[PDB]
Amino acid sequence: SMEQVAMELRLTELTRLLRSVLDQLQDKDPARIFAQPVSLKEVPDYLDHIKHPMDFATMRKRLEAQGYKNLHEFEEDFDLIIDNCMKYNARDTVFYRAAVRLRDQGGVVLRQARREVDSIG
């Protein structure tokens, strides 16, 4: 149908906007602490701690499969990255501190993205 196509154009454009958001969030992690999944070879007990692991490469795979329906779903995945880290790692670690800084710096980007998504529909 003509509608399904219209729908698919909006998804593609959402994907386009979310790709830019993702790049902006990932620049706020210059140490690349959150770039890839926590290695289960190097942290064999990780899944006993964190039930829903997340990282930027995993989000990108979902993004490029047009797997995010709205910004809320995308934010859920970003929030997992941060919250998983803040639980697994203690307060006095480079990892916990990296997550706090990502959360704080990402807030600005996510604020404007919500306005853009509402604005452009």
Side-chain angles (χ1 to χ4, degrees), residues 67-68 70-92:
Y68 293 114
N70 51 57
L71 185 58
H72 182 77
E73 289 186 342
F74 179 97
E75 288 171 307
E76 286 197 335
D77 272 355
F78 179 68
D79 286 339
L80 275 177
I81 294 176
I82 297 308
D83 291 338
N84 289 343
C85 185
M86 289 178 80
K87 288 170 193 60
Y88 190 81
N89 304 105
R91 204 156 41 249
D92 74 341

PDB file of all heavy atoms in Angstrom, residues 67-92, unseen atoms left out:
ATOM      1  N   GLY A  67      15.239  -1.303  13.993  1.00  0.00           N
ATOM      2  CA  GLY A  67      14.651  -2.003  15.118  1.00  0.00           C
ATOM      3  C   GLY A  67      14.165  -1.083  16.247  1.00  0.00           C
ATOM      4  O   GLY A  67      13.612  -1.562  17.285  1.00  0.00           O
ATOM      5  N   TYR A  68      14.392   0.229  16.119  1.00  0.00           N
ATOM      6  CA  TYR A  68      13.803   1.151  17.093  1.00  0.00           C
ATOM      7  C   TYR A  68      12.526   1.809  16.511  1.00  0.00           C
ATOM      8  O   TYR A  68      12.622   2.642  15.630  1.00  0.00           O
ATOM      9  CB  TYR A  68      14.797   2.214  17.550  1.00  0.00           C
ATOM     10  CG  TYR A  68      15.976   1.646  18.390  1.00  0.00           C
ATOM     11  CD1 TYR A  68      17.286   1.687  17.910  1.00  0.00           C
ATOM     12  CD2 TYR A  68      15.768   1.076  19.619  1.00  0.00           C
ATOM     13  CE1 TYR A  68      18.353   1.158  18.640  1.00  0.00           C
ATOM     14  CE2 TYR A  68      16.846   0.521  20.371  1.00  0.00           C
ATOM     15  CZ  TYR A  68      18.121   0.577  19.861  1.00  0.00           C
ATOM     16  OH  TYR A  68      19.186   0.027  20.589  1.00  0.00           O
ATOM     17  N   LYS A  69      11.401   1.504  17.100  1.00  0.00           N
ATOM     18  CA  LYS A  69      10.089   2.092  16.656  1.00  0.00           C
ATOM     19  C   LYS A  69       9.867   3.561  17.022  1.00  0.00           C
ATOM     20  O   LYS A  69       9.209   4.310  16.277  1.00  0.00           O
ATOM     21  CB  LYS A  69       8.937   1.258  17.190  1.00  0.00           C
ATOM     22  N   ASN A  70      10.411   3.977  18.166  1.00  0.00           N
ATOM     23  CA  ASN A  70      10.284   5.348  18.664  1.00  0.00           C
ATOM     24  C   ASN A  70      11.536   5.676  19.519  1.00  0.00           C
ATOM     25  O   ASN A  70      12.311   4.767  19.796  1.00  0.00           O
ATOM     26  CB  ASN A  70       9.025   5.458  19.490  1.00  0.00           C
ATOM     27  CG  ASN A  70       8.918   4.373  20.560  1.00  0.00           C
ATOM     28  OD1 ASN A  70       9.812   4.216  21.426  1.00  0.00           O
ATOM     29  ND2 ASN A  70       7.820   3.630  20.537  1.00  0.00           N
ATOM     30  N   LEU A  71      11.739   6.945  19.855  1.00  0.00           N
ATOM     31  CA  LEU A  71      12.821   7.376  20.746  1.00  0.00           C
ATOM     32  C   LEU A  71      12.802   6.706  22.122  1.00  0.00           C
ATOM     33  O   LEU A  71      13.886   6.495  22.693  1.00  0.00           O
ATOM     34  CB  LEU A  71      12.764   8.864  20.984  1.00  0.00           C
ATOM     35  CG  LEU A  71      13.871   9.532  21.790  1.00  0.00           C
ATOM     36  CD1 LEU A  71      15.248   9.291  21.164  1.00  0.00           C
ATOM     37  CD2 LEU A  71      13.605  11.021  21.864  1.00  0.00           C
ATOM     38  N   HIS A  72      11.633   6.430  22.682  1.00  0.00           N
ATOM     39  CA  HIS A  72      11.535   5.780  24.026  1.00  0.00           C
ATOM     40  C   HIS A  72      12.316   4.456  24.061  1.00  0.00           C
ATOM     41  O   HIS A  72      13.096   4.209  24.982  1.00  0.00           O
ATOM     42  CB  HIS A  72      10.076   5.566  24.528  1.00  0.00           C
ATOM     43  CG  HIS A  72       9.988   4.962  25.893  1.00  0.00           C
ATOM     44  ND1 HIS A  72      10.218   5.691  27.042  1.00  0.00           N
ATOM     45  CD2 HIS A  72       9.737   3.693  26.294  1.00  0.00           C
ATOM     46  CE1 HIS A  72      10.096   4.897  28.093  1.00  0.00           C
ATOM     47  NE2 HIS A  72       9.811   3.677  27.666  1.00  0.00           N
ATOM     48  N   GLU A  73      12.143   3.632  23.032  1.00  0.00           N
ATOM     49  CA  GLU A  73      12.860   2.335  22.956  1.00  0.00           C
ATOM     50  C   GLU A  73      14.411   2.506  22.910  1.00  0.00           C
ATOM     51  O   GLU A  73      15.134   1.715  23.501  1.00  0.00           O
ATOM     52  CB  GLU A  73      12.413   1.531  21.732  1.00  0.00           C
ATOM     53  CG  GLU A  73      10.983   0.960  21.824  1.00  0.00           C
ATOM     54  CD  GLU A  73      10.597   0.036  20.661  1.00  0.00           C
ATOM     55  OE1 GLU A  73      11.258   0.065  19.613  1.00  0.00           O
ATOM     56  OE2 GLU A  73       9.627  -0.743  20.815  1.00  0.00           O
ATOM     57  N   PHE A  74      14.864   3.505  22.196  1.00  0.00           N
ATOM     58  CA  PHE A  74      16.254   3.866  22.030  1.00  0.00           C
ATOM     59  C   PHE A  74      16.803   4.369  23.341  1.00  0.00           C
ATOM     60  O   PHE A  74      17.847   3.928  23.768  1.00  0.00           O
ATOM     61  CB  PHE A  74      16.409   4.893  20.920  1.00  0.00           C
ATOM     62  CG  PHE A  74      17.808   5.378  20.660  1.00  0.00           C
ATOM     63  CD1 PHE A  74      18.617   4.851  19.656  1.00  0.00           C
ATOM     64  CD2 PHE A  74      18.294   6.435  21.401  1.00  0.00           C
ATOM     65  CE1 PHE A  74      19.862   5.387  19.398  1.00  0.00           C
ATOM     66  CE2 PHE A  74      19.549   6.957  21.164  1.00  0.00           C
ATOM     67  CZ  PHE A  74      20.339   6.433  20.153  1.00  0.00           C
ATOM     68  N   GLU A  75      16.084   5.247  24.003  1.00  0.00           N
ATOM     69  CA  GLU A  75      16.498   5.711  25.323  1.00  0.00           C
ATOM     70  C   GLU A  75      16.568   4.596  26.353  1.00  0.00           C
ATOM     71  O   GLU A  75      17.476   4.607  27.221  1.00  0.00           O
ATOM     72  CB  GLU A  75      15.552   6.788  25.862  1.00  0.00           C
ATOM     73  CG  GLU A  75      15.690   8.085  25.158  1.00  0.00           C
ATOM     74  CD  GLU A  75      14.595   9.093  25.544  1.00  0.00           C
ATOM     75  OE1 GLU A  75      13.357   8.806  25.469  1.00  0.00           O
ATOM     76  OE2 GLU A  75      14.978  10.196  25.876  1.00  0.00           O
ATOM     77  N   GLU A  76      15.647   3.633  26.267  1.00  0.00           N
ATOM     78  CA  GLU A  76      15.688   2.486  27.157  1.00  0.00           C
ATOM     79  C   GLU A  76      17.052   1.773  27.062  1.00  0.00           C
ATOM     80  O   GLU A  76      17.679   1.458  28.105  1.00  0.00           O
ATOM     81  CB  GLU A  76      14.589   1.458  26.868  1.00  0.00           C
ATOM     82  CG  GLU A  76      13.201   1.880  27.312  1.00  0.00           C
ATOM     83  CD  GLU A  76      12.204   0.727  27.399  1.00  0.00           C
ATOM     84  OE1 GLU A  76      12.360  -0.322  26.713  1.00  0.00           O
ATOM     85  OE2 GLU A  76      11.280   0.899  28.213  1.00  0.00           O
ATOM     86  N   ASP A  77      17.491   1.535  25.831  1.00  0.00           N
ATOM     87  CA  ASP A  77      18.803   0.866  25.570  1.00  0.00           C
ATOM     88  C   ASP A  77      19.943   1.764  26.093  1.00  0.00           C
ATOM     89  O   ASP A  77      20.900   1.259  26.733  1.00  0.00           O
ATOM     90  CB  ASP A  77      18.972   0.461  24.121  1.00  0.00           C
ATOM     91  CG  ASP A  77      18.411  -0.933  23.820  1.00  0.00           C
ATOM     92  OD1 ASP A  77      17.960  -1.664  24.786  1.00  0.00           O
ATOM     93  OD2 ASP A  77      18.481  -1.314  22.620  1.00  0.00           O
ATOM     94  N   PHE A  78      19.908   3.057  25.826  1.00  0.00           N
ATOM     95  CA  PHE A  78      20.995   3.931  26.380  1.00  0.00           C
ATOM     96  C   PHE A  78      21.054   3.916  27.906  1.00  0.00           C
ATOM     97  O   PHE A  78      22.125   3.770  28.527  1.00  0.00           O
ATOM     98  CB  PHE A  78      20.777   5.355  25.877  1.00  0.00           C
ATOM     99  CG  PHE A  78      21.785   6.336  26.375  1.00  0.00           C
ATOM    100  CD1 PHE A  78      23.076   6.245  25.950  1.00  0.00           C
ATOM    101  CD2 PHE A  78      21.423   7.365  27.210  1.00  0.00           C
ATOM    102  CE1 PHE A  78      24.033   7.123  26.409  1.00  0.00           C
ATOM    103  CE2 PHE A  78      22.361   8.315  27.635  1.00  0.00           C
ATOM    104  CZ  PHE A  78      23.664   8.172  27.213  1.00  0.00           C
ATOM    105  N   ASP A  79      19.897   3.989  28.539  1.00  0.00           N
ATOM    106  CA  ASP A  79      19.795   3.918  29.970  1.00  0.00           C
ATOM    107  C   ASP A  79      20.334   2.574  30.533  1.00  0.00           C
ATOM    108  O   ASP A  79      20.939   2.622  31.602  1.00  0.00           O
ATOM    109  CB  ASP A  79      18.354   4.155  30.454  1.00  0.00           C
ATOM    110  CG  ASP A  79      17.935   5.632  30.363  1.00  0.00           C
ATOM    111  OD1 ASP A  79      18.772   6.554  30.321  1.00  0.00           O
ATOM    112  OD2 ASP A  79      16.716   5.858  30.363  1.00  0.00           O
ATOM    113  N   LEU A  80      20.161   1.462  29.805  1.00  0.00           N
ATOM    114  CA  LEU A  80      20.735   0.179  30.220  1.00  0.00           C
ATOM    115  C   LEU A  80      22.236   0.223  30.292  1.00  0.00           C
ATOM    116  O   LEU A  80      22.834  -0.349  31.212  1.00  0.00           O
ATOM    117  CB  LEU A  80      20.349  -1.021  29.313  1.00  0.00           C
ATOM    118  CG  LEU A  80      19.057  -1.739  29.589  1.00  0.00           C
ATOM    119  CD1 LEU A  80      18.919  -2.815  28.473  1.00  0.00           C
ATOM    120  CD2 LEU A  80      19.056  -2.379  30.981  1.00  0.00           C
ATOM    121  N   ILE A  81      22.835   0.852  29.303  1.00  0.00           N
ATOM    122  CA  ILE A  81      24.301   0.959  29.282  1.00  0.00           C
ATOM    123  C   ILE A  81      24.800   1.581  30.593  1.00  0.00           C
ATOM    124  O   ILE A  81      25.698   1.043  31.280  1.00  0.00           O
ATOM    125  CB  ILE A  81      24.792   1.772  28.057  1.00  0.00           C
ATOM    126  CG1 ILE A  81      24.499   1.037  26.709  1.00  0.00           C
ATOM    127  CG2 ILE A  81      26.270   2.036  28.180  1.00  0.00           C
ATOM    128  CD1 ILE A  81      24.866   1.791  25.494  1.00  0.00           C
ATOM    129  N   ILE A  82      24.175   2.698  30.941  1.00  0.00           N
ATOM    130  CA  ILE A  82      24.566   3.494  32.103  1.00  0.00           C
ATOM    131  C   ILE A  82      24.250   2.735  33.391  1.00  0.00           C
ATOM    132  O   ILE A  82      25.074   2.640  34.336  1.00  0.00           O
ATOM    133  CB  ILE A  82      23.789   4.840  32.113  1.00  0.00           C
ATOM    134  CG1 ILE A  82      24.148   5.694  30.872  1.00  0.00           C
ATOM    135  CG2 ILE A  82      23.990   5.590  33.444  1.00  0.00           C
ATOM    136  CD1 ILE A  82      25.618   5.932  30.615  1.00  0.00           C
ATOM    137  N   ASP A  83      22.996   2.240  33.484  1.00  0.00           N
ATOM    138  CA  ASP A  83      22.553   1.705  34.761  1.00  0.00           C
ATOM    139  C   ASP A  83      23.270   0.368  35.070  1.00  0.00           C
ATOM    140  O   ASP A  83      23.578   0.101  36.242  1.00  0.00           O
ATOM    141  CB  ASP A  83      21.046   1.511  34.756  1.00  0.00           C
ATOM    142  CG  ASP A  83      20.263   2.795  34.740  1.00  0.00           C
ATOM    143  OD1 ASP A  83      20.716   3.870  35.121  1.00  0.00           O
ATOM    144  OD2 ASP A  83      19.062   2.706  34.353  1.00  0.00           O
ATOM    145  N   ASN A  84      23.551  -0.448  34.048  1.00  0.00           N
ATOM    146  CA  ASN A  84      24.250  -1.714  34.204  1.00  0.00           C
ATOM    147  C   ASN A  84      25.617  -1.394  34.800  1.00  0.00           C
ATOM    148  O   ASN A  84      26.081  -2.011  35.765  1.00  0.00           O
ATOM    149  CB  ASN A  84      24.426  -2.466  32.928  1.00  0.00           C
ATOM    150  CG  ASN A  84      23.114  -3.085  32.357  1.00  0.00           C
ATOM    151  OD1 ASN A  84      22.125  -3.215  33.060  1.00  0.00           O
ATOM    152  ND2 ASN A  84      23.150  -3.457  31.114  1.00  0.00           N
ATOM    153  N   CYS A  85      26.272  -0.423  34.179  1.00  0.00           N
ATOM    154  CA  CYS A  85      27.639  -0.051  34.646  1.00  0.00           C
ATOM    155  C   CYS A  85      27.694   0.433  36.099  1.00  0.00           C
ATOM    156  O   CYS A  85      28.642   0.165  36.851  1.00  0.00           O
ATOM    157  CB  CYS A  85      28.139   1.026  33.696  1.00  0.00           C
ATOM    158  SG  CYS A  85      29.881   1.538  34.010  1.00  0.00           S
ATOM    159  N   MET A  86      26.734   1.284  36.483  1.00  0.00           N
ATOM    160  CA  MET A  86      26.652   1.845  37.805  1.00  0.00           C
ATOM    161  C   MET A  86      26.312   0.792  38.888  1.00  0.00           C
ATOM    162  O   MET A  86      26.462   1.036  40.096  1.00  0.00           O
ATOM    163  CB  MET A  86      25.676   3.061  37.781  1.00  0.00           C
ATOM    164  CG  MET A  86      26.364   4.200  37.020  1.00  0.00           C
ATOM    165  SD  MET A  86      25.373   5.728  36.807  1.00  0.00           S
ATOM    166  CE  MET A  86      25.642   6.413  38.389  1.00  0.00           C
ATOM    167  N   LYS A  87      25.747  -0.330  38.448  1.00  0.00           N
ATOM    168  CA  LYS A  87      25.497  -1.423  39.386  1.00  0.00           C
ATOM    169  C   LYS A  87      26.740  -2.353  39.529  1.00  0.00           C
ATOM    170  O   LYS A  87      27.132  -2.635  40.660  1.00  0.00           O
ATOM    171  CB  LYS A  87      24.222  -2.164  39.036  1.00  0.00           C
ATOM    172  CG  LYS A  87      22.980  -1.344  39.350  1.00  0.00           C
ATOM    173  CD  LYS A  87      21.810  -2.089  38.710  1.00  0.00           C
ATOM    174  CE  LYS A  87      20.590  -1.268  38.653  1.00  0.00           C
ATOM    175  NZ  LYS A  87      20.734  -0.015  37.865  1.00  0.00           N
ATOM    176  N   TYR A  88      27.294  -2.778  38.412  1.00  0.00           N
ATOM    177  CA  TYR A  88      28.397  -3.738  38.347  1.00  0.00           C
ATOM    178  C   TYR A  88      29.648  -3.187  38.965  1.00  0.00           C
ATOM    179  O   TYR A  88      30.341  -3.856  39.759  1.00  0.00           O
ATOM    180  CB  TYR A  88      28.616  -4.276  36.951  1.00  0.00           C
ATOM    181  CG  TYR A  88      29.570  -5.399  36.942  1.00  0.00           C
ATOM    182  CD1 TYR A  88      29.178  -6.703  37.278  1.00  0.00           C
ATOM    183  CD2 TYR A  88      30.941  -5.179  36.637  1.00  0.00           C
ATOM    184  CE1 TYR A  88      30.121  -7.728  37.351  1.00  0.00           C
ATOM    185  CE2 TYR A  88      31.873  -6.227  36.700  1.00  0.00           C
ATOM    186  CZ  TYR A  88      31.478  -7.467  37.076  1.00  0.00           C
ATOM    187  OH  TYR A  88      32.483  -8.461  37.087  1.00  0.00           O
ATOM    188  N   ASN A  89      29.886  -1.918  38.655  1.00  0.00           N
ATOM    189  CA  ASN A  89      31.123  -1.241  39.110  1.00  0.00           C
ATOM    190  C   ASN A  89      30.891  -0.379  40.310  1.00  0.00           C
ATOM    191  O   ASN A  89      29.867   0.350  40.396  1.00  0.00           O
ATOM    192  CB  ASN A  89      31.722  -0.444  37.919  1.00  0.00           C
ATOM    193  CG  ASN A  89      31.960  -1.307  36.739  1.00  0.00           C
ATOM    194  OD1 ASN A  89      31.226  -1.279  35.743  1.00  0.00           O
ATOM    195  ND2 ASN A  89      32.933  -2.124  36.828  1.00  0.00           N
ATOM    196  N   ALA A  90      31.843  -0.334  41.249  1.00  0.00           N
ATOM    197  CA  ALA A  90      31.754   0.520  42.392  1.00  0.00           C
ATOM    198  C   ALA A  90      31.947   2.007  42.039  1.00  0.00           C
ATOM    199  O   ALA A  90      32.551   2.381  41.033  1.00  0.00           O
ATOM    200  CB  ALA A  90      32.734   0.046  43.519  1.00  0.00           C
ATOM    201  N   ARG A  91      31.449   2.844  42.910  1.00  0.00           N
ATOM    202  CA  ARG A  91      31.541   4.295  42.793  1.00  0.00           C
ATOM    203  C   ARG A  91      32.936   4.851  42.519  1.00  0.00           C
ATOM    204  O   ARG A  91      33.084   5.811  41.789  1.00  0.00           O
ATOM    205  CB  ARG A  91      30.940   4.904  44.091  1.00  0.00           C
ATOM    206  CG  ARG A  91      30.414   6.279  44.003  1.00  0.00           C
ATOM    207  CD  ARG A  91      29.352   6.539  45.088  1.00  0.00           C
ATOM    208  NE  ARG A  91      29.626   6.009  46.421  1.00  0.00           N
ATOM    209  CZ  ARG A  91      28.969   5.016  47.016  1.00  0.00           C
ATOM    210  NH1 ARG A  91      28.008   4.337  46.376  1.00  0.00           N
ATOM    211  NH2 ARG A  91      29.342   4.651  48.248  1.00  0.00           N
ATOM    212  N   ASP A  92      33.964   4.256  43.110  1.00  0.00           N
ATOM    213  CA  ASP A  92      35.335   4.764  42.957  1.00  0.00           C
ATOM    214  C   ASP A  92      36.106   4.163  41.748  1.00  0.00           C
ATOM    215  O   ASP A  92      37.344   3.956  41.815  1.00  0.00           O
ATOM    216  CB  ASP A  92      36.110   4.554  44.275  1.00  0.00           C
ATOM    217  CG  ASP A  92      36.499   3.099  44.537  1.00  0.00           C
ATOM    218  OD1 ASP A  92      35.907   2.174  43.939  1.00  0.00           O
ATOM    219  OD2 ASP A  92      37.406   2.876  45.383  1.00  0.00           O
TER     220      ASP A  92
END
